[PDB]
Design a protein around this ligand. Sequence first.
Ligand SMILES: [Ca+2]
Ligand SMILES: [Ca+2]
Lengths: 330, 330
Amino acid sequence: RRYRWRIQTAWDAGTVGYSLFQKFTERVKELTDGQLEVQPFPAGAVVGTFDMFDAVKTGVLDGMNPFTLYWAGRMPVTAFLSSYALGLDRPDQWETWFYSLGGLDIARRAFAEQGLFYVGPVQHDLNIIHSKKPIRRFEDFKGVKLRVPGGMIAEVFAAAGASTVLLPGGEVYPALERGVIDAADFVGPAVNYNLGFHQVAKYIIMGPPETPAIHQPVDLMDFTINLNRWRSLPKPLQERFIAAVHEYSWIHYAGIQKANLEAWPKYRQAGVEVIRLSNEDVRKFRRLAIPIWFKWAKMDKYSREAFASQLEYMKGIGYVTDEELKGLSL
Amino acid sequence: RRYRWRIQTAWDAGTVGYSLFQKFTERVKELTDGQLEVQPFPAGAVVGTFDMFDAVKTGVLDGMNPFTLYWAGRMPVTAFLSSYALGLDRPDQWETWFYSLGGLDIARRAFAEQGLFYVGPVQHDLNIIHSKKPIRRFEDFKGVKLRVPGGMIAEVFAAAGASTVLLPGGEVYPALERGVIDAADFVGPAVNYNLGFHQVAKYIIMGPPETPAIHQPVDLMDFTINLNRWRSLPKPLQERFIAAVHEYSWIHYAGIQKANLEAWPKYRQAGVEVIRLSNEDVRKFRRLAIPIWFKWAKMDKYSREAFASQLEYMKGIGYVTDEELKGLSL
Ligand SMILES: [Ca+2]
Ligand SMILES: [Ca+2]
């Protein structure tokens, strides 16, 4: 018997990300000798991006390739299954945490309670911010209407005085064009260019060279499958799909990074100015961020479990000092 | 039809690396439903580590899991298929170069001329140095007899005044114990501890926090198969083995990194002092390293091709300035 799964991605059609996702479906067919095929759908083709969770839960979709933290408002732990401000900031650190420090099992247990099978994380990129007006220091965030992906990311910017809004990446261009928002984070340079941000915002705001991505340094995607659908798939094919997703994680990461190298010169040609914040701006954000990490960790049992092991790992690699954790504990 | 390959690894028996490699063989069996099985062999079990290349080329071994740059003396390009001093220094950069910037095909073409199939790189770790006496500054390397893995790694230390020796990792302990050498680089902290270096050298020499690994920040392994054995394998299984190796690359990396976290406290208990060199020391090594990149790059068509794309990538991410390239060329 052969299996066919409908899977929608958070990537919009006409982006480098969707092209990579389409190629993944061909790779899955190849690795399973046609026994398991994935029918790809670009963002919004079946349901809205933020509605994918419920669509997969019910079976309208068989699976999804979202940015994991989109479920932060309903599953606290998902804010810890993708990067948060000023924490672990390299792809390899998130890979180690998931694959040898216990992160994958925490994600699987949390998603199983929701009737979903979390396959694994998909590496991707850091994220940048586009702004219509210059934001040159920490204090310039006050009063900025900023699109962000909710959760802990939005909470940190709200603590910096911004008015945050949640919108799918495909709605950012018209929101900026119409002046509904002043600035927007979405993903890295290449996809944001595919979406036209350079024509509706003349600035890019990044951290200093020492900390280029303050809010989302490792913006992970994942594959999450309807649990019944997953359990119905023969084990040999389940294992081949897990391996296919892990291989794709890095093929996707590499494809996005190649496109990003090609994108920076295009921003220069479009007259977009890249503004770099300072090391002191980062210290200000850090004092806002750390207590917010603990607030989120304290929401439920899974968020606490995930943050506890990430905090131990950060201490082990010198990312956090005991002094800056004064008054904060699990 | 079932296929069985004997593959020897550069990892010695009794190390975390070898344990990870044994688990990989089980994973391969699982992913191929038993159609392709790998019989693992630890370092030296069938042939000496540096003799694996000829063993695989001639069919004595079906494949190998070496540190790729061990072939630098016979294949110049292999010095560019693993990290070299002060160049690309993050796992993700090497992953991008191989998987989207053309590196994998350069490696495959170069190895095919040798009658070998280069499957793909296996992520691993940065490397540290163990010394019997303190080495606290750049100038302290002069006169030190140091074990290193040849190629560009040895050339950079030779340029700093050290006398270099090539020895397999399994001979480093007796070389230090008997005073044949003064210091040795091998791999990361956990495996070097498995091999007992803390008993025979009471110092670890590392770069500053800003540049912890000056010489080998991304010490890649790989899987290389006898070309005829490879071509004899059905395409579906070839593709499954490629996916298995790419999944393993990161499972191996994560396993090594978890072990490393556990090893540091053991060095403290063993009375080993971790010495940190300075940013100025790194600058002194950099003045020697860059010219050596160019010296090796011009050795043949493949080294030229690989370094040319790595250099363009380094320029794109700000790893090299035009000023420091003044006076250098291929
Ligand atoms: Ca974002
Ligand atoms: Ca080494």
